[PDB]
Each structure stands twice: as C-alpha cells, then as structure tokens.
Design a protein around this ligand. Structure first.
Ligand SMILES: CCCCCCCCCCCO[C@@H]1O[C@H](CO)[C@@H](O[C@H]2O[C@H](CO)[C@@H](O)[C@H](O)[C@H]2O)[C@H](O)[C@H]1O
Lengths: 93, 431
C-alpha cells in the first residue's frame, strides 16, 4: 500500500490526540439500568432548556423578518385596493 | 491431601506430612478485606504488617521461627514456621502475639512506622503493578458498593486516616474464637498440637460472634484508567462466576482451563492446544493472557486478563477471545473438555500438594472456615472426571451467553472499544 498524506485524525490506537493520564471513567451496562423511563422524567422536565437559552437568537430575527413581510404585504394590499390607486400611480411608474 | 479436625471451643485442624522437614502452626480468621468498610479499608493489611513488624520478627528469629501473614478477601492468616520439634515454641509465640501483645505491637513508634511502610508499599503497587492493579479494579467495578469490591491492601486515602483505634475495633470484632481455626501443617501430628493448646487456658475475646452485612452483587460495568505514558494496555474482563460451594465450581474451573494461560515469548506456550491461539498469533495480538475462575464466599468472577503492545488491534484480541467463549455454549468439543480435565487436575495438584507448609496452612484454614474440612484431591478428581460436554454447555449457557460483563484496564487502551461493542460479542447471531 502507498503512502497517503497526514491528517489531524488517525484511527483506534493512534487517534491523533494528546497523551491522556489521570482521567478515570466509569460506566454501567444498559442492561442494568432502569428500563428507559427517562422519556417522560428528565426529558419533559428538562424540556425547553434548549429553548429559553437560544430562542432569542432565533425569535428576534424571525420577528424582524415576519414584521417586514407583514408590513410589505399590507402595503401591497392597500396599493391594489380602490383607496390606493392614487398612491399606486405615483410609486409605480 | 488428608485432614483431621477436633474441637473444645477452639477449633483445631491439621494435616500431617511425614516428608515435610518443617512445620507451620498458626491462626486463620474468616474475615478479610470483604469484611472491612470503604473507610477502614486496609485495616487488615495493616494488621498483617505489624505482626511481621521488625521487633516482632526479631523475637521470633531468636526462637528459630519464621513469620507469615496473608490477607485475602474472605480470610486472614497469621502463621509461624519452625523445625518439626520446635512446634511447642511456635504456639508460645502465637499465644504471646495474639493474647498478650494487644499494646506491645501497637506502640506509637511501631505503628506510625508500619503505617508509613504499608503506605509506600501500596503507593508502589498502585504506581507500578499494572496487571494486579487492573485485576483489583476489576473486583472494584464488578462488585461496586458491595463487600467484594474493596482492595485487599486498601486505599491510600483510608490507609492514611487509620489510627490504633481502628486496628483495635477490627480486632475486637473479627479476631474472635468463633471466627478462627488454629492450623497446623507440616510433619507434626494432630493428637499432639491440641495438647499444647490445652496446656494453656483462658478465653480472652470469646463468646462473641462476628458482624454481618449486605451480600456481594455483580454489576455489569467498567472502569477505565487510560494512561498513554505506559508501554502497554493491560485489561481484565469477566462475567459473574461461581462462589465456593457452588455445584458448578469445578465446571467453571474446567472452562477456564480450556482457554488457559499464554506467554507469547515461551516456545512451548505457543504450541498449546487452545484454538484461540490460531487467531491471536498471526498478528500477535498480545504478549500474554490468562483465564481464571475466581471463587469467594458470596460470588465469583470468570474471565481473563491480558497484556499487549499491539495497541491498534485490541478490538481483535477481545473479539477473538469472546468469540471463543461463545463456543463453550454451542460447540466446545469432547477433546477440548478432556484436555481441560487433565490440566485442571495438574493445576489442582501443584496447588494442594506443594512441598510448602505455609501454603497448606492457608488452604486448610480458609477451607474449614467455610465447608468445615479441606477437600481431598481424590474426590475433586472424581468430580472433574465426571464433567461432560453438556455440563460445560449448560454452564456456559447461564454464566456466559449474552451475560453482563465487568471490565477494567489501564495503559494504552484507546483501542479498547465501548462497553456495548464488547457486551455484544457475548453471543452470536443465529436463525
Ligand atoms: C433492509 C431492510 C430489511 C430489514 C429486515 C429486518 C431484519 C431483522 C433481523 C431480526 C433479528 O435477528 C436476530 O437478532 C437478535 C439480536 O437482536 C440476535 O440475537 C443474538 O443477540 C442477542 C442479544 O442482543 C442474544 O440474546 C441472542 O441469543 C443472540 O442470538 C438473533 O440471533 C438474530 O437472529
């Protein structure tokens, strides 16, 4: 097999990270854990966590764009109604 | 292996050996590390060390006596060795050390020095004995929050918090007559050792029964102590095994013998009749491994330990080993069972009939403390010869096939995959 280029990721046994020392990890077999009831205990309780932390970053631009749309949509509606033909002749041509 | 046991309050058990040349007398208690708490853990290892204290050893050396102490999970021993005739003086030292030196050995100078010794002793073990340190963590994760999880030597944290008071409280609760057996092995006769015991009297620390608590429980889990600075990956993996007195005690041991032990550096070891060897030698998946069937009072551990420098093929080492284990449930052959019978006998032989009296003392005591009398090889060999392929399959079908596992490892274990990937290999797909 030919020599290919070096990258920032290797494989099992030589992944490419720094040497690890002092960290101990523990785990328990899924077979020994409470038959999954965390769907309506720590998922619905902890629900809206990802919401109230991030929603503003989405809601403000969402609101800005929705308002701009509704505003322009209503202006169009008026421009094409009887009451708006005067301003329509102006702003158009 | 031939026993003889009598009682008069103090239970005495011996095993004569006309070709001994020496004799060992001592006491063994039915309490070990599994009888300690997570906070007084190491108190037994501490007792062992003050008994073997420099002062105490000089007092025995002048008498032509050699001291020995072994701390295990279920039992604890203190043995004295001498020539066949000086046996009368060994009992005097035992009586002196455990029925008079309740404050002699516990002096501020002797204690603080011993404590300091076992502290460095344990710090070294935890620092350099990777295969045993891993095996100890195997017990620690497998029986977590349960008696069997505590390390026999104890932890550095609880070790340095121990005071003479801790040593005494343990002694008051475990160094009792109802929880002991006076042992005599070597060439001395039974109806002679009991006399010297009857020669004295008293009953200091008697009548009381030892304490009780919760039973050992196996939990499928793992503890990973990754250390990339080490040159190897040391791992130990096992299922819940058999307790002493289990109907499958010998079947489980025969199963372990089937996969055996291996040292990739010894020519003869590479030639053993273990199918697993055909899979791991092509790419040299490890430097060594050894299967085991550890048995204690409440539970056991059946599995193996391995050491390897092939850090990129650990998944294959594990995969191939567990795939061979599956065979015990579905395809183990007659010849494999017959080869295991022969070798189990051989190992039981080298264990129970070594020329060493202190080994026989520990085995005699620890065994009578559970079943009431050490088992003869003749009977063991008969149970072993009766094991059929079906016995092995039925056993593997319950302790191995698709059962939870306990894992522990240190060193370069990045290549050791997740729990589930390992747990999956405990069975095979079928129609
Ligand atoms: C491309 C779409 C086509 C989808 C077709 C669907 C395929 C369904 C395959 C279903 C079952 O296939 C079946 O899986 C189970 C595991 O779940 C296997 O079980 C195996 O592992 C389980 C453990 O998890 C063991 O208890 C069992 O003794 C062992 O045989 C079984 O031997 C296999 O036969």
């Amino acid at each position: 097999g030919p020599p290919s280029g070096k990258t920032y990721m290797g494989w099992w046994g030589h992944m490419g990270g720094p040497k690890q020392k002092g960290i101990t990890s523990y785990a328990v077999s899924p077979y020994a854990q409470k038959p999954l009831q965390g769907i309506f205990h720590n998922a619905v309780f902890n629900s809206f966590r990802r919401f109230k932390s991030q929603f503003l970053y989405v809601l403000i631009p969402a609101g800005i764009y929705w308002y701009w749309w509704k505003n322009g949509n209503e202006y169009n509606e008026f421009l094409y109604s009887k009451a708006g033909r005067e301003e329509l002749e102006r702003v158009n041509v | 292996a031939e026993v003889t046991q009598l009682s008069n309050g103090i239970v005495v058990a011996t095993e004569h050996n006309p070709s001994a040349h020496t004799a060992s007398v001592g006491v063994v208690f039915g309490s070990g590390a599994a009888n300690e708490n997570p906070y007084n853990n190491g108190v037994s290892n501490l007792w062992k060390n003050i008994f073997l204290s420099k002062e105490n050893s000089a007092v025995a050396a002048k008498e032509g006596l050699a001291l020995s102490s072994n701390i295990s999970r279920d039992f604890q021993s203190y043995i004295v060795s001498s020539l066949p005739g000086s046996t009368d003086k060994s009992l005097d030292f035992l009586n002196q050390s455990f029925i008079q030196q309740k404050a002699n050995l516990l002096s501020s100078s002797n204690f603080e020095a011993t404590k300091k010794s076992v502290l460095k002793q344990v710090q070294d073990f935890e620092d350099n004995d990777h295969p045993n340190r891993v095996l100890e963590h195997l017990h620690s994760t497998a029986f977590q929050n349960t008696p069997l999880s505590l390390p026999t030597r104890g932890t550095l944290e609880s070790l340095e918090n121990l005071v003479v008071a801790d040593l005494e409280s343990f002694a008051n609760n475990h160094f009792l007559n109802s929880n002991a057996v006076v042992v005599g092995t070597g060439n001395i006769k039974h109806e002679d050792l009991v006399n010297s015991i009857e020669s004295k009297n008293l009953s200091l620390q008697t009548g009381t029964k030892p304490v009780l608590k919760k039973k050992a429980a196996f939990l499928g889990s793992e503890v990973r102590l990754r250390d990339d600075t080490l040159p190897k990956a040391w791992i130990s993996l096992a299922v819940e095994g058999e307790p002493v007195n289990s109907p499958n005690y010998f079947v489980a041991k025969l199963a372990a013998q089937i996969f055996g032990s291996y040292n990739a550096f010894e020519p003869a070891s590479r030639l053993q009749g273990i199918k697993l060897l055909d899979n791991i030698q092509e790419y040299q998946l490890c430097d060594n491994f050894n299967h085991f069937s550890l048995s204690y009072k409440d539970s056991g551990l059946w599995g193996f330990s391995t050491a390897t420098r092939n850090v990129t093929m650990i998944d294959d080492l594990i995969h191939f080993t567990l795939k061979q284990w599956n065979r015990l449930t579905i395809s183990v052959t007659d010849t494999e069972v017959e080869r295991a019978k022969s070798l189990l006998k051989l190992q039981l032989g080298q264990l129970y009939e070594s020329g060493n009296p202190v080994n026989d003392a520990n085995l005699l005591g620890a065994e009578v403390l559970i079943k009431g009398s050490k088992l003869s090889l003749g009977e063991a060999f008969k149970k072993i010869d009766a094991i059929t392929v079906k016995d092995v399959k039925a056993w593997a079908g319950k302790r191995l096939w698709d059962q939870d596992i306990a894992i522990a490892g240190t060193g370069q274990i990045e290549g050791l995959l997740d729990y589930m990937r390992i747990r999956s290999d405990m069975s095979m797909m079928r129609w």
